[PDB]
């Protein structure tokens, strides 16, 4: 069972430098007297590490509290312990650290290690209540107060203790590295004596692999485990703990890096070189040696990276005559369909989509927000006046009088149907009967089939011969379009736009957003389909009115015409190059200089 | 979005089919993600388990 402590009070972190530690064997192969390069998760040389006291005294009274904040676990963690009296006991790993996500617990008592993977319900302040025996005192007895409950256990492991017994300045380093890759949780370990070094000591010691765990769980945050020998019920004034917590622990975070390790003859990692630390290190990487001779060497290649992209489009008030069709005064009858075509002109579908005046938008095959994105070979506009309840009949694969007897709609549309109410423009008080509808036909119609024949249909067996009578009706009936009529009978103005998407030239395109011109900074540009990278500058050349391109002596294009306002712009790739390191012999000094070939020093 | 290889997602969050947020409640353009099927001995070969 768990027992609650006092608040952590959010103590400010403390930082300290790490001097070339944490190198672990990346693989399981024996290699002798060879320099080998590896790209893997490492701890950078001369990095920041955060340091926590095991027991901290910050209150004026002399309060002793356990510094055990939760810490992020981002892709490997290096844990170093400066310790002398066996106070740390284990670790916990998870995302939520509760009964909601799978959790990992490693503990170490005086006998062995316990590795457990279950759905533990942890308390806010896990610890191990430890005490000595009244006679022997050789070993410490531990009571677990780490979790409340454990369920759904999928792993168990026991082996030799991870922490050697520490039972008066004989401080030692215990260095561990945890990684979690491909569902495998790898622990690399090392133990080392030290003297009179409070921080991480300057030196080098490899990390050998200790254990691999087929856990396969997901880890984001972790917490260390500490042993309370004191009485949480009755805290002493002082000296109940351990000299105000001299023993403590340092945490560092790994990230992907490339190293050069030097295997000696025995196979022991004796030195390593970080590759991106400083230019001399980059030279040692590129030359693949531990020592660099005097001279000049080419190591890397400098290159400016564009930060943004630009796309450009023309500048014309004239466009597709959508306004003249949608806002037209008169619209044809619904059984003699006026079909219009729009071509060789630019379409702005955002005017129609964002108008917030059209009652129905129904696009099939193309999303309505990408209507301006795509280029269509042709667009057919059909604009008529239909009753409200029959607006639903205008869609692929539907039935009804208009759907069947008027105009069949195929099931493979790539186009849009748009409708807006026309009560105040089409209806009159006395009834507008200028739109005629047929209710009887011999058979259902073909897709995109127009019939205007006015022959009187034969409902019975006797022939009509173009004359009404018994079982003989004229095809077209009138609608009572009135401003007082209901929703189903009021007139709605409907336009269908069918887009032709074939392997054919595109005459209808969306200018989209004419991205404002941003020059004198090499950007990713896309002019009328040309995609490239480079800097745009004003140029005094003159293109012919039909010419859109400018070519160098080679195939590389240089100057492009601005569709908005001509003033030809010219393109220049933005200053690539190469970095050289000027250094003397490394046995003299490690100071270096950097030279950037073929570029001045403003973009560096 | 499409998923990473061998990636396990167990979330039961109600997806937002529209622009309005669902906030874990079904409704308009809001649905539970999982659907079940009538695995039956009389179904066609294409629909057999």
């Amino acid at each position: 069972q768990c027992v609650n402590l006092t608040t952590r009070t959010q103590l400010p972190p403390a930082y300290t430098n790490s001097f070339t530690r944490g190198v672990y064997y990346p693989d399981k192969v024996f290699r002798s007297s060879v320099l080998h390069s590896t790209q893997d998760l490492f701890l950078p040389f001369f990095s920041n590490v955060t340091w926590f006291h095991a027991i901290h005294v910050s209150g004026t009274n002399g309060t002793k509290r356990f510094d055990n904040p939760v810490l992020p676990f981002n892709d490997g963690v290096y844990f170093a312990s400066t310790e002398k009296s066996n106070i740390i006991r284990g670790w916990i790993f998870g995302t939520t650290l509760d009964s909601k996500t799978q959790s990992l617990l490693i503990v170490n008592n005086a006998t062995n290690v316990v590795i457990k993977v279950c759905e533990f319900q942890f308390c806010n302040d896990p610890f191990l209540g430890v005490y000595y025996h009244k006679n022997n005192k050789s070993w410490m007895e531990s009571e677990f107060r780490v979790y409340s409950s454990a369920n759904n256990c999928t792993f168990e492991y026991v082996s030799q203790p991870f922490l050697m017994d520490l039972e008066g300045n004989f401080k030692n380093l215990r260095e561990f590295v945890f990684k979690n890759i491909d569902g495998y949780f790898k622990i690399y370990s090392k133990h080392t004596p030290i003297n009179l070094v409070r921080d991480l000591p300057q030196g080098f010691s490899a990390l050998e692999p200790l254990v691999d765990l087929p856990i396969g769980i997901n880890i984001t945050r972790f917490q260390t485990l500490l042993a309370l020998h004191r009485s949480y019920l009755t805290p002493g004034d002082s000296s109940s703990g351990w000299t105000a917590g001299a023993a403590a622990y340092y945490v560092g975070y790994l990230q992907p890096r490339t190293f050069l390790l030097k295997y000696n003859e025995n196979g022991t990692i004796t030195d390593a070189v970080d590759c991106a630390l400083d230019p001399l290190s980059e030279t040692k990487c590129t030359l693949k040696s531990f020592t660099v001779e005097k001279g000049i060497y080419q190591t890397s290649n400098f290159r400016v990276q564009p930060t943004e992209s630009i796309v450009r489009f023309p500048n014309i008030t004239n466009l597709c005559p959508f306004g003249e069709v949608f806002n037209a005064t008169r619209f044809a009858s619904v059984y003699a369909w006026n079909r219009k075509r729009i071509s060789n002109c630019v379409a702005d579908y955002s005017v129609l989509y964002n108008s917030a005046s059209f009652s129905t938008f129904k696009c099939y095959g193309v999303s309505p927000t990408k209507l301006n994105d795509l280029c269509f070979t042709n667009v057919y506009a059909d604009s008529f006046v239909i009753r409200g309840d029959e607006v639903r009949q205008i869609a692929p694969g539907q039935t009804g009088k208009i759907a069947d007897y008027n105009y069949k709609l195929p099931d493979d549309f790539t186009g849009c149907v748009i409708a807006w109410n026309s009560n105040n423009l089409d209806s009159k008080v006395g009834g507008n009967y200028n739109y005629l509808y047929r209710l009887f036909r011999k058979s259902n119609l073909k897709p995109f089939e127009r019939d205007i024949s006015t022959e009187i249909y034969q409902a019975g067996s006797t022939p009509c011969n173009g004359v009404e009578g018994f079982n003989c009706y004229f095809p077209l009936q009138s609608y009572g379009f009135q401003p007082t009529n209901g929703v189903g009978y009021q007139p709605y103005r409907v336009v269908v736009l069918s887009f032709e998407l074939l392997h054919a030239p595109a005459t209808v395109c969306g200018p989209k957003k004419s991205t404002n011109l941003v020059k004198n900074k090499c950007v990713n540009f896309n002019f009328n389909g040309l995609t490239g990278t480079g800097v745009l500058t004003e140029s005094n050349k003159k293109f012919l009115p039909f010419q859109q391109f400018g070519r160098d002596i080679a195939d590389t294009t240089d100057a492009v015409r601005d569709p908005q306002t001509l003033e030809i712009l010219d393109i220049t790739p933005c200053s690539f190059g190469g970095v050289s390191v000027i250094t003397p012999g490394t046995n003299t000094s490690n100071q270096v200089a950097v030279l950037y070939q073929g570029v001045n020093c403003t973009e560096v | 979005s499409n998923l990473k290889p061998f990636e396990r997602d167990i979330s039961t969050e109600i997806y937002q089919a529209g622009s309005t947020p669902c906030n874990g409640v079904e409704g308009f353009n809001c649905y539970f993600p999982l659907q079940s099927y009538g695995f039956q001995p009389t179904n066609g070969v294409g629909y057999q388990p």
Partner: nanobody
Amino acid sequence: QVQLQESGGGLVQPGGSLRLSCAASGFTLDYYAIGWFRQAPGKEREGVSCISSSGGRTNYADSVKGRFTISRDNTKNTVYLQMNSLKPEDTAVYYCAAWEASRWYCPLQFSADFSSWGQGTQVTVSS
């Protein structure tokens, strides 16, 4: 993609209660003022109950005063009308509409054109 969808309609007993809900998809319904309308068999579409954009102004038909209450959730973008003491006179095809105020003044008592219309639900009261 602007859609208004009504729901909750059906058959109820006279003197009973019913609740009707219209939702907006493809656009935000908070900006618009919302009116609930009905059309009875053989009658014209009359104004039942209107609510403002912010919900601070409401208007009711005199036939439904003291029986119907209109409300709105701008967070859930949904407009509700609660019916109490329903009568056979209330059987109608029932629509939700959204529009912006066409006249000066806060009150929504006056009528105008209505921008967006749903398909509606049937409300039948008979026993």
